[PDB]
Every structure is written in C-alpha cells, then in structure tokens.
Design a protein around this ligand. Structure first.
Ligand SMILES: CCCCCCCC/C=C\CCCCCCCC(=O)OC[C@H](COP(=O)(O)OCCN)OC(=O)CCCCCCC/C=C\CCCCCCCC
Ligand SMILES: CCCCCCCC/C=C\CCCCCCCC(=O)OC[C@H](COP(=O)(O)OCCN)OC(=O)CCCCCCC/C=C\CCCCCCCC
Ligand SMILES: CCCCCCCC/C=C\CCCCCCCC(=O)OC[C@H](COP(=O)(O)OCCN)OC(=O)CCCCCCC/C=C\CCCCCCCC
Ligand code: HEC
Ligand code: HEM
Ligand code: HEM
Ligand SMILES: COC(=O)CNC(=O)CCC/C=C\NC(=O)c1ccc(Cc2ccc(I)cc2)cc1
Ligand SMILES: CCCCCCCCO[C@@H]1O[C@H](CO)[C@@H](O)[C@H](O)[C@H]1O
Ligand SMILES: CCCCCCCCO[C@@H]1O[C@H](CO)[C@@H](O)[C@H](O)[C@H]1O
Ligand SMILES: CCCCCCCCO[C@@H]1O[C@H](CO)[C@@H](O)[C@H](O)[C@H]1O
Ligand code: FES
Lengths: 67, 241, 49, 59, 100, 79, 49, 379, 48
C-alpha cells in the first residue's frame, strides 16, 4: 500500500476552477442523459473538455514527483 | 466518433534537442516490457545484444537471453530442436503469427512494439496517456462486451485490458512501482527501442551546429572579401565634350 | 521485325503467368451478428460481407 | 607580430599553407571532439551508460 | 482626361525605375524590334543609354539606389527610343501584310 | 565558347576599384549597411505581407469554423 | 464501414460516401462498388467462386 | 596553346562552363538555387546508392530491410535521414528556383525553361517511386492511388495501369520494378540537367533588372563560386538541423506500419510537396475532372512563356504584377494547407476557391494586369 | 505448366488434387492440409 503520485495530483487539479467549471457541466450532462431513454445525446464532449483541462494540469506537475 | 481527445506534453527527461534518454528509466522500462508486455506484444526489431553497453552489461544480457528457449535447426536428422538463447537472437514473439494472437485476445491484434512510439500521432506522449487514462464511459456510451473504455484511444473502445497497476512488478533498483512510474519507464524504453541512435544522433547535432556556426561565418567573410571589389567600385561617364 | 520485338518486350511488363486461378471462399453467415461488417482476404483485394 | 609571422611562415608559400591546414585540422579535430563530447556528457550527467556503468560492472 | 495624366505620373513613381536613374525606355525588354531600334540610335544617345544601365547594374549589385536628388522626374523623362521603335514596328507591319 | 570580348560596345566609362587587401571586410555596418537593410524591408513589406496576412486569416477562420462545427448544439437535445 | 453520411461506407482518400448498398452517393467517386457473383447454401453459410 | 585550360577538350569544359563563364555582375541569391539543386541531385544519388546497397525490393522484406539498414548498418540510420529529407530540401529548392524564374521572367529563355519543367516532372515522379520502396502503409496506399490516376484515361486506361503494377493489383512485381525505376530516374535527371544548363549557356544568365548586362559581366569564379559555397552552407544548416534534431517533423508516422492491402488508413495525406496537387485533385468532384485539373495544375507551366504581356522582363518594376505574384504564392500556401485537411466544410469550399483563383491568376490576371501596366507607362 | 502441353485443363485439376498441400494459417493460426490446385508446384518428397 503506497500512493501513486498520479492519483494524488489528479485530486489536487480537479480543484482548479477550469476543472470544476467543466466538471460541473458534465455532472449536469450525465444527469439529464442517464435519466432518459430513447435519446441520442452522449456526454463525451463534456467529458473530454474535463479530462482535457484536468490532465493538462496533471502534466505540469506529475513528472516532478516521478523518479 | 467524429471527435477525439488529444494528449498533453509531459517533459520527458530526454525531450530537449540535447537531452539523452534516461539510461536508467530505459533499463526499467525494459523490465516492464519483459515482465508485462512481452506476453502479447512482439518486439521483432530489437535484440538482446542491443541492450549491451546501453542498459545492461555483457554478462547480464547473456543470462537474459538464456532465459528463453528458441527454435533453431534442422539438425542432422532434419528435426527442429529447441535450444537456449544467445545474445544474437531477437526478442521472442508471443505468438507464431497474427492469426494466433488475434484468437487469444478476442480478435484484436496487439501490434509489435518496436516502432510503436513513432507510429502513433503523439508518440511517447500518447502511449503514456493511453496506459494511464483508462476510465468509465460517460453518459450515453455503451462499450461492446470485451472492449474497455479509454477516452484517449480513437473510437474509445480499445481491445487492450488495462495492463498496469501499482506493484504489478517490482524494479530491482528499489523504485516505487506506482502505475505512472512504470508507464513513464516503459514509454521511455519504447523510445530507445524505436530509435537507439537517439543519443549519438543528438550528440552529432550539437557538433554540427557548432561547426555550421563557425564555418558559415568564416565564409561570410571570404564571400564579402572577394565581392568588396565590386561593392566599393565607382564609375563615371566622361564623354568627349 | 521491330513491331514484334517491341510487342515481345512490352508484354514482359504485363501480368505474369504465376497469376493464380481464383474462386475459393468459406463463410459462416452465423459468425456475423446483425448490423456489422467484416473483411476477408479475397482474390487479392478485400471483400465485404 | 603574430599575423606577420603568420603570413610569413604560413599563409605565404602555397606549399606550407596547405601543410598547415593539415597539421592544423588535426589538432582541431582532436580538440573539438573532446569539447563537444564534454559539453554533451555534461549536459546529460548521470543519464549515460558511461555513468550508470559501475552499478552492474562487477569489479 | 487629366486622370490618366495624374494616374500615369503615379504609376511612374510606383514602378520606381527612376530610383536607378533609368529612363522609361532604358528598362524596355529587348525583343527583335527594340534591338533593331537601338542600333539606329545616334552615336551618343546610345553611349549615354549604355552608361545609365551599366550604372544601374552596378547599383543592383551593391543593393543601393541613387540619392533622392538624382532620380528621374516623371516630366523630365526623355523617351529617346519610342519614335525609332514605332518606325521599326511600322516598317515591319508592312513587310508582313505585303507578303500575301 | 568565348564570350569575353564579343559582348557589347561601350564608350567613355572609367572605373576605379581597390584590391580586397586594401579595403574592409564589411564596412559601415551602421552608417550605411543596416539603414539600407531597412529601406528595402520598408518598401517591400507592403506588397508582400498583405496577401500573406490575408492567408493567415483565412487559415484561422477555416480552422476555427471547423473545430466549432465539431462541438454540439444544445437546441437539438432540449427536446 | 461504419462512417459517412449514408450509414454505409466512406473512403478517406478523397471523400467518397457509399451507402449500405455500396452504391456511390457523394464525392469524386463515379461508379458503385463492384459486386461479386455469389450464392447462398444453408441456414448460416454462403460461398462465392 | 597558350594555356592548357582553353585547348584541352575536357578541361576546357569545366573552364568554359564553370570558371570563365560570364555572369551578370548583379545576379542575386535567387540565382543560387541553381547550383544547390545540382548539389542536391548529386548528393541524393550518393546517399541513394549507399542505401540501395542494403535495401531488398520484395514485399516480404522491403520494410524490414530498411529497418535493418537503420539499426544494423554503420551510420545507416543517418544515411537514410539525409536521403529521406534531401528529397524535401530538394523540392524546396526547386520551388524557389521556379518562383525566381516566374518573377524575373527567366521563362523567356524558353528552351532553358521547358527543360526545367520536364526536370520537375521527373523529380516529382522520382520521389513518388522512391517513397514506395520502404513498403509502408502510405507507400502502399500511395502507390495504389497514384498509379490509379492513369485509370482516368478512357480505353487504354484500366489497361495502362496493369503494366505499372505488373499485376491486377499492387504487389511484388510493382515494388521491384519501382526500385528499378527509382534507381534509374535520377540519372536521367542528371542527364537532362545537362541539357538544361547547356541551353542556358547560349544566352547567359538573366538578371534582377531585366535589361542587357553585356555592359558589365564577371567570371563565375571567384564571384559566384564563392557566393554559392556560402549559399550552400546557409541552406545546409536548416536541412541538417531537421535531419539531426527532428528527423520526423516533415514525415507522416502512419508509414511506420507495414503495408496492409486490406486497411486503408483513416487519416491519409501525401508528403507535403504533393499537397497542392492533392488539393486540386480533391477540389473537383469527378474522377476525370480532378485528374485533368491536376494534370493542368502543373502542365500549365508550359504556358507561362506565352502568357507574358508586359513590355518589361522582370516584375521588379511592376508593383501591380508583384502584388498579384505574391497573391499567387500565398494562394499556393493555402492550397497546400487545404491538402493537409480532410474533406469537410469549410475546407471543401476553401479548396475549390483557391484552385479557381490559382488558375485564374495565371491564365487571366497576369496577362491582363500585364497589358494594363504597359498602357500606364504610355507604350 | 502441363496444361496446353501434355494434359487438358480438366486432367491437371484432377492431377493436382491427388495431393494434399500445406496452406494456412487459418482463423486460429493452425496450418491445415487441403487439396491441390493447379497453382501449386510439384511436391517435395522431403521437408529439407
Ligand atoms: C502490323 C505492322 C505495322 C507496322 C507499323 C510501323 C510503321 C513504320 C513505317 C515508317 C515509314 C518508313 C518510310 C521512310 C521514308 C524515308 C525515305 O525516304 O526512305 C527510307 C530511307 C532511305 O532513303 P531512300 O531509299 O533514298 O528513299 C527515297 C524515297 N523517294 O532510310 C533507310 O535507309 C531505311 C532503311 C534502314 C533500316 C534500318 C534498320 C535495321 C536494323 C535492324 C534491327 C531490328 C530491329 C529491332 C528494333 C528495336 C527497337 C527498340
Ligand atoms: C584528422 C583530419 C585530417 C584531414 C586531412 C585532409 C587534408 C586536406 C587538406 C588539403 C590542403 C588544402 C590547401 C589548399 C591550397 C589551395 C590555396 O591556394 O588556398 C585555398 C583556395 C583559395 O585561394 P587563396 O585563399 O587565395 O590561397 C593562396 C595561398 N597563398 O581555395 C578555397 O577557396 C578553399 C576553401 C573552400 C572550401 C569549400 C568547401 C565548403 C563545403 C562544405 C560542405 C561540407 C563538406 C562535406 C564533404 C562531402 C564530400 C563527399
Ligand atoms: C508549390 C508548393 C507549396 C510550397 C510553399 C513554398 C514555401 C513558402 C515560403 C515563402 C517564401 C519566402 C519569400 C519571402 C521573400 C520576401 C522578399 O524579399 O520579396 C521581395 C523581393 C523584391 O525583389 P526586387 O523587386 O527584384 O528588388 C530589386 C533589388 N532591390 O522579391 C524576391 O525576392 C523575388 C521573388 C522570389 C521568391 C519566390 C518563392 C515563392 C515560392 C513559390 C512557388 C511558385 C511558383 C508556382 C509553382 C507551381 C507548381
Ligand atoms: C493482454 C495482452 C496485452 C498486454 C500484456 C499488453 N497489451 Fe498492449 N495491446 C493489447 C491489445 C489487444 C491491443 C490492441 C487494441 C486494439 O487495436 O483494439 C494493444 C494495443 C496496444 C497499444 C496501442 C494500439 C493503438 O492502436 O493505439 C499500445 C500502445 C500498447 N498495447 C501498449 C502496451 C504496453 C506498454 C504494455 C506493457 C506495459 C502492454 N500493451 C501490454 C494487449 C495487451
Ligand atoms: C533538377 C532540376 C533543376 C536543376 C538542378 C536546375 C539547375 C539550374 C541551374 C544550375 C541554373 C543556373 C543558375 C540559376 O539561375 O539558378 C538553372 C537555370 C534556370 N533553370 Fe533550372 N534547374 C532545374 C530545374 C528547373 C525547373 C523545374 C525550372 C522551371 C520550370 C527551371 C528553370 C530554369 C531557368 C528559367 C533558368 C534560368 C535562370 C535565370 O533566369 O538566369 N530549372 N537551373
Ligand atoms: C533523384 C533523387 C532522389 C530522390 C528525389 C529520392 C527520394 C527518395 C524517397 C522519397 C524515398 C523514400 C524515403 C523514405 O523512406 O522516407 C527514397 C528511398 C530510396 N531511395 Fe531514393 N531518391 C533519389 C535518388 C535515389 C537514387 C539515385 C538511389 C540509388 C539508385 C536511391 C535509392 C533509394 C533507396 C535504397 C531507397 C529505399 C530505402 C529508404 O527508403 O530509405 N534513391 N528515395
Ligand atoms: C512522395 O510520395 C507521396 O507523397 C505518395 N504518397 C501519397 O500520396 C500517400 C497518400 C496516398 C493517397 C492519395 N494521394 C493522392 O491523391 C495524390 C494525388 C496527386 C499527387 C501528385 C503526383 C501525381 C503524379 C505523380 I507520377 C506523382 C505525384 C500525389 C498524391
Ligand atoms: C582501435 C580502433 C577502434 C575502433 C572502434 C570502432 C567503434 C566505433 O565506436 C563509436 O564511438 C563513438 C564515440 O564518440 C560513439 O558515439 C559511437 O556510437 C560508437 O559506435
Ligand atoms: C533481324 C532479326 C529480326 C528477328 C524478327 C523475328 C520476330 C520474332 O517473331 C515472334 O515469333 C513468335 C513465334 O511464332 C511469335 O509467338 C511472336 O509473337 C513473334 O513476335
Ligand atoms: C563541368 C560542368 C558542366 C556544366 C554543364 C554545362 C554543359 O554547354 C557548352 O556547349 C559548348 C559547345 O558544345 C561546349 O564547348 C562547352 O564546354 C559546354 O559547356
Ligand atoms: S480512392 Fe476513394 S475517395 Fe479517392
């Protein structure tokens, strides 16, 4: 039991405004879509927007902690 | 999926136009390949001798290569026989042909990873994120049975089961085998594996830039020097009158 | 003479003689669920089913 | 004056001009190589096999 | 009207062959007619055209131009060849239509 | 193969020039060189840049408009 | 297969859109996909030659 | 008798075309590309042989031989790099060498020009075949699309292709005969280059001012021999900088995957130097149209000499033409970019336009501005 | 090669079918025997 600096910083970043702002947009997409069947919509976009902002952030620090 | 998510830009220790590979992260990456990937992924253009002088000692490699039984022959009766591996052999295929591999991975073909780093838009940057980035499908996305979600992979339905997880193996140099720490080392290896010259390539580059700087200037002189005669020249039209 | 030597040499470029016979195919309509497509190494070029 | 001594014993006689570029280049190489190798092995400290070498070279 | 006339002057300063001291007809491309014309030039007018060009060439090689005060001015530009040329051409036009 | 001598008829032109060894490598880098390097740049940037800039724009638009058409319009899902 | 504006095919080389019948619908392409002369045999089988 | 540099039936040549050669005292740097192109050719050929000495033209070993050459041959890798990119550096140089000609109307030296065109055409073809040798995914699919182009001609169409492939579809016979082609063509270029230069030497070089230069010429040596050695090193730096610091910048990576006659890749682009063509072929939505537009997109060069209407030779003194010229250049830059992009809006329409504008600037705007210009000088 | 020279098309087909050749791999990656087609070369009596 040890901690992968990744999941530690993946946390930290999800706090940056950019992240939350997109994190929320998704939370919402996820909701309207999950609660409705005979759709078409998908929350990929919203997700990417998120992962995009998130990981981009992860990228700036992650390697400092890795060996 | 008309849409796609592109990867970020990690500052690999060797990214700079003068930065050599991390010959230690490579030795590790290797171990990661040897102990994890080499069960589905072929490395046909690399061979144990390549390691010598780069990540392992001559003695080590010999032993390394002897941990495998290869198919040599025919003998004197004409039978193919197994024999221990020599430094001159290439890394063993996990399958006898693509037809087989597919069948043992759900019709999916785990591509040889020799030039992989250079065959996917993004290189080591992409290979890293694919490895780490595995996750759950967002709202409205159904991933066919046998396929896992991965936002980084095109189509997001990748036939490769997430290959790494903390402690999945244990480096002999005493390094924290966290998911990324591995994915960093293996991605670093792939690079070396994909263009072993890399180092000597950048070293020359430097040398080139240095001669090329000096020599270009030295000639800017000799071009002007000679031309001066025509640039300083003056002429006049003196008719009869 | 000339016309025949050019003919001769020129067909040297066209298809060889080791250009196979063709026609062969085994297919189980059952392996293909409804709504999907598959590629088969047929007579040189792909074949969609 | 160096330039004069230069021009007299070197750059003048076409025969010795050449003889210089030769014995000259020689030194240049020998020297240049060292530098670049050093400027390089230095910018990549502890990352070259030449640096890791002793951790396995049983000696 | 006095438009083409205020236009031409512009274009003239625009092409800027004056910056090199070259008259309008110094920059003419030398086809067969021009060639012919140039040969009909009075001893001097030719030796003069010559200098101007060998001087302009010397400029283009040095990458410089003439100081503002030596440039040709739209109205002081002598069309020393235009007449000789129109004659060559006029002459030729004849021979051609006559050969039918 | 000889072209030097049969070229053209020139009269009354005097030219003077100096041995390279007598003159400077590159002279007046500031009192003459640069100030001319500029002039040139000046006179030509107005014929060249325009259409290039014109392209740049078109490139960005085309690109920006394309990435825009990839996003999703809510008005199709608010139903 | 599984791309395009006609639920059939798409050729990324110069953008030709084919439908589920393999018929050419949009793009530079000019003729419909060739079709092999084939036949069915059993419940879930089929062969060409 | 007197000197052994003008009477030796051989030495006289190197001296009659490379030393005493009379050159306008004022040709710029856009005249340098001439040599570079030459040095470029001779250089490709060297790396070329060196390479060919390890390649093995045969589908089942083409790809692997190139890798073995890189990985196992001493400095092999480097040797490929220089060759692979030299091609670009080559196309680059040739491109300016053509623009130089357009701007200063060198195209009035018809023969010297037309040969040039042929030369281009050959280089183009040459690179095409070379690119297929490594038998990669593009190699294949490229070899498959390009040759297929001739299938646009009716009757002898489908049939002509057969020779090309040497089969009923791209396979070994194609590869091996391409290797032959590639090995041979360069030499033909070197040959025509000789005619090209030889035609030029009847008239002397053109020059930036577009007027007689007899009034003052200088020996190629040491004026231009020196100017060129420098020019060479100024262009050589970036080209080495790429082939030493970013080998794969200009190169598609999809071609790192062994050809698969069963899967055409999703993101298919030819190497940069063919994009503008690519764009035009893709602009017209018709097999034949696209081909034709393509065919003319380059074959038009043969016309440039008959579309000259200005009373002057160079554009130096024709601002209008100049702006139109730079508009054309940029116009081209776009077309290229467009080729780099997929067939979708807006791209499709943008492509379509740029093409129209390309052809139009050459066929109508240049001859029209050209005339107008004259009347504004009062001729 | 026999066709048109010593045997009829029909004969050769049969002739070549009198032998089992080694084709493959299949779908699972196994080499399987199959009847001979006119396009095969005469069979080696030994594997090497
Ligand atoms: C189905 C077949 C269809 C064949 C289509 C081919 C059509 C080609 C026909 C070309 C027309 C030929 C007419 C030539 C006209 C020139 C001429 O004047 O005569 C020939 C003229 C001579 O002048 P006179 O006799 O004085 O004529 C005066 C007329 N009042 O030239 C000659 O000497 C011709 C004979 C020389 C033949 C040389 C060839 C010998 C070589 C043999 C090797 C074999 C060939 C292999 C070719 C390989 C090519 C890659
Ligand atoms: C360990 C290293 C050992 C190296 C061994 C190589 C030995 C080669 C030395 C040859 C001797 C050189 C002497 C030349 C003598 C000629 C001469 O007179 O001077 C040079 C003479 C000029 O005349 P002057 O300056 O007036 O001299 C008057 C003397 N009183 O010629 C020159 O201009 C020489 C400089 C031009 C250099 C051109 C090369 C530039 C190209 C660069 C690209 C890079 C190289 C790649 C090569 C690839 C080959 C396949
Ligand atoms: C084709 C495929 C597409 C490839 C794209 C090509 C790469 C694009 C990079 C652009 C090139 C940079 C050029 C910037 C130079 C700016 C400059 O100095 O221009 C002004 C300057 C002024 O000179 P003068 O009027 O004579 O002055 C007299 C002395 N005082 O003009 C010049 O230098 C001459 C123009 C030569 C440049 C031509 C290069 C452009 C290349 C494109 C190819 C076009 C031809 C068509 C090809 C068909 C296939
Ligand atoms: C369980 C077998 C298995 C193991 C072990 C495995 N992979 Fe894979 N891998 C696959 C499969 C299957 C695919 C093909 C995915 C597809 O095309 O649907 C694949 C594909 C890949 C791809 C990307 C393919 C693409 O098109 O982008 C990369 C990169 C890769 N694997 C890396 C690794 C690395 C690194 C490791 C070792 C640390 C590893 N794999 C271990 C099965 C595996
Ligand atoms: C392998 C092909 C080519 C090579 C190596 C080559 C080489 C040369 C050389 C050495 C020169 C003389 C110096 C110079 O003016 O640059 C020259 C001149 C010239 N070339 Fe090329 N050339 C090639 C292709 C072309 C092409 C494709 C064109 C355009 C269709 C062309 C058109 C010309 C013209 C017009 C000149 C006259 C130069 C002038 O205006 O003074 N060349 N070429
Ligand atoms: C005419 C100038 C030349 C051009 C424009 C040229 C261009 C190219 C191109 C585009 C490739 C593919 C490069 C790649 O794999 O990325 C290539 C490959 C090759 N060329 Fe050339 N080439 C030239 C001349 C030659 C000559 C003269 C030979 C020797 C006869 C040669 C031998 C080869 C070989 C062996 C390959 C295959 C190996 C490889 O791809 O690296 N080439 N060339
Ligand atoms: C360097 O080689 C390459 O770039 C070839 N590879 C590719 O084009 C890879 C992608 C293949 C798919 C489409 N290509 C084209 O449509 C294409 C069309 C025209 C050209 C120019 C060209 C024409 C004839 C001739 I002859 C030559 C060129 C080149 C490519
Ligand atoms: C005594 C003669 C010995 C010749 C040995 C040839 C081995 C070549 O050794 C070379 O040394 C270089 C050092 O700068 C490295 O950069 C190269 O990668 C390596 O191949
Ligand atoms: C100078 C000598 C010229 C030799 C010309 C002989 C031309 C060969 O003629 C050949 O004869 C074969 C046998 O019938 C035919 O099958 C070929 O199609 C035909 O081209
Ligand atoms: C060695 C450099 C060669 C450059 C290529 C140009 C050729 O062309 C010229 O034709 C004349 C008449 O036949 C000959 O006398 C000249 O020697 C020749 O250069
Ligand atoms: S080959 Fe299919 S669109 Fe051109």
């Amino acid at each position: 039991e040890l901690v992968d600096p990744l999941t530690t910083i993946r946390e930290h970043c999800e706090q940056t405004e950019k992240c939350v702002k997109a994190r929320e947009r998704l939370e919402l997409c996820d909701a309207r879509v999950s609660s409705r069947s005979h759709t078409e919509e998908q929350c990929t976009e919203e997700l990417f927007d998120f992962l995009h902002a998130r990981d981009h952030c992860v990228a700036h620090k992650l390697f400092n902690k890795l060996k | 999926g008309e849409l796609e998510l592109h990867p970020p830009a990690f500052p690999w220790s060797h990214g700079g136009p003068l930065s050599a590979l991390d010959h230690s992260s490579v030795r590790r990456g290797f171990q990661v390949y040897k102990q994890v990937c080499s069960a589905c992924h072929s490395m046909d253009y690399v061979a144990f001798r390549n390691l010598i002088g780069v990540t392992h000692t001559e003695a080590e490699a010999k032993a390394l290569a002897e941990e495998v039984e290869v198919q040599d022959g025919p003998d004197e009766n004409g039978e193919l026989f197994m024999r221990p591996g020599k430094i001159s052999d290439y890394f063993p295929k996990p399958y006898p042909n693509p037809e087989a591999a597919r069948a043992a991975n759900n019709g999916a073909l785990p591509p040889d990873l020799s030039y992989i780093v250079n065959a996917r838009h993004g290189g080591e940057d992409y290979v890293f994120s694919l490895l780490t980035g595995y996750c759950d499908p967002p709202a409205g996305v159904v991933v066919r049975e046998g396929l896992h979600y991965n936002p980084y992979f095109p189509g997001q339905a990748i036939g490769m089961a997430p290959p790494i997880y903390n402690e999945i193996l244990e480096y002999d140099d005493g390094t924290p085998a966290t998911m990324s720490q591995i994915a960093k080392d293996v991605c670093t290896f792939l690079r070396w594996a994909a263009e072993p010259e890399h180092d000597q390539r950048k070293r020359m580059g430097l040398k080139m830039l240095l001669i090329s700087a000096l020599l270009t200037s030295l000639l800017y002189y000799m071009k002007r020097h000679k031309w001066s005669v025509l640039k300083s020249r003056k002429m006049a039209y003196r008719p009869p009158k | 003479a000339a016309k025949n030597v050019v003919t001769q040499f020129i067909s040297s470029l066209s298809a060889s003689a080791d250009v196979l016979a063709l026609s062969k195919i085994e297919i189980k309509l059952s392996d293909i669920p409804e709504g999907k497509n598959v590629a088969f190494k047929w007579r040189g070029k792909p074949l969609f089913v | 004056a160096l330039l004069r001594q230069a021009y007299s014993a070197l750059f003048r006689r076409t025969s010795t001009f050449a003889l210089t570029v030769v014995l000259g280049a020689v030194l240049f190489e020998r020297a240049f190589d060292q530098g670049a190798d050093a400027i390089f092995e230095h910018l990549n400290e502890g990352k070259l096999w030449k640096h890791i070498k002793h951790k396995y070279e049983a000696s | 009207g006095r438009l083409m006339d205020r236009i031409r002057k512009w274009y003239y300063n625009a092409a800027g062959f004056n910056k090199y001291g070259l008259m309008r007809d110094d920059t003419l491309y030398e086809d067969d007619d021009v060639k012919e014309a140039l040969k009909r030039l009075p001893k001097d007018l030719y030796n003069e055209r010559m200098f101007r060009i060998k001087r302009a060439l010397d400029l283009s090689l040095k990458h410089r131009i003439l100081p503002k005060e030596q440039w040709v001015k739209y109205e002081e530009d002598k069309p020393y060849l235009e007449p000789y040329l129109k004659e060559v051409i006029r002459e030729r036009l004849e021979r051609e239509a006559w050969n039918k | 193969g000889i072209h030097f001598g049969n070229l053209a008829r020139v009269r009354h032109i005097i030219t003077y020039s100096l041995s390279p060894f007598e003159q400077r490598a590159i002279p007046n880098i500031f009192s003459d060189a640069l100030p001319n390097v500029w002039r040139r740049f000046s006179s030509q940037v107005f014929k060249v840049a325009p259409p290039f800039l014109g392209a740049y724009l078109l490139y960005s638009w085309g690109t920006q408009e394309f990435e825009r058409l990839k996003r999703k319009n809510p008005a199709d899902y608010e139903n | 297969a599984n791309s395009g504006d006609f639920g059939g095919y798409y050729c990324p080389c110069h953008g030709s859109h084919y439908d589920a019948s393999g018929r050419i619908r949009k793009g530079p392409a000019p003729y419909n996909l060739e079709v092999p002369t084939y036949q069915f045999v059993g419940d879930d089988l089929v062969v060409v030659g | 008798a007197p000197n052994i540099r003008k009477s030796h039936p051989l030495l006289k040549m190197i001296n009659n075309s490379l030393i005493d050669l009379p050159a306008p005292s004022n040709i710029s740097a856009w005249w340098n590309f001439g040599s570079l192109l030459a040095v470029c050719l001779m250089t490709q050929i060297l790396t070329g042989l060196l390479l060919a000495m390890h390649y093995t033209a045969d589908t089942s070993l083409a790809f692997s031989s190139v890798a073995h050459t890189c990985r196992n041959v001493q400095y092999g890798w480097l040797i490929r790099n220089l060759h692979a990119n030299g091609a670009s550096f080559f196309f680059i140089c040739i491109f300016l060498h053509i623009g130089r000609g357009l701007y200063y109307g060198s195209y009035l030296y018809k023969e010297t020009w037309n040969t040039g065109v042929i030369l281009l055409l050959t280089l183009m073809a040459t690179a095409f075949v070379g690119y297929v040798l490594p038998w990669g995914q593009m190699s294949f699919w490229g070899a498959t699309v390009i040759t297929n182009l001739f299938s646009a001609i009716p009757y002898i169409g489908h049939t002509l292709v057969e020779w090309a492939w040497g089969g009923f579809s791209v396979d070994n016979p194609t590869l091996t005969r391409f290797f032959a082609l590639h090995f041979l063509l360069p030499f033909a270029i070197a040959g025509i280059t000789i005619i090209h230069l030889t035609f030029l030497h009847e008239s002397g070089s053109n020059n930036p001012l577009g007027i007689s230069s007899d009034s003052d010429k200088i020996p190629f040596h040491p004026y231009y021999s020196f100017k060129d050695i420098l020019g060479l090193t100024l262009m050589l730096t970036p080209f080495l900088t790429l082939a030493l610091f970013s080998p794969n910048l200009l190169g598609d990576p999809e071609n790192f995957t062994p050809a698969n006659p069963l899967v055409t890749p999703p993101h298919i682009k030819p190497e940069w130097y063919f994009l503008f063509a690519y764009a035009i072929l893709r602009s017209i939505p018709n097999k034949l149209g696209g081909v034709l537009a393509l065919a003319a997109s380059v074959l038009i060069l043969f016309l440039i000499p008959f579309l000259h209407k200005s009373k002057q030779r160079t554009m130096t003194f024709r601002p209008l033409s100049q702006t139109l010229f730079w508009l054309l250049v940029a116009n081209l830059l776009i077309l290229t970019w467009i080729g780099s992009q997929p067939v979708e809006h807006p791209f499709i329409i943008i492509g379509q336009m740029a093409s129209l504008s390309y052809f139009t600037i050459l066929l109508i705007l240049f001859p029209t501005i050209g005339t107008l210009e004259n009347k504004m000088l009062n001729y």
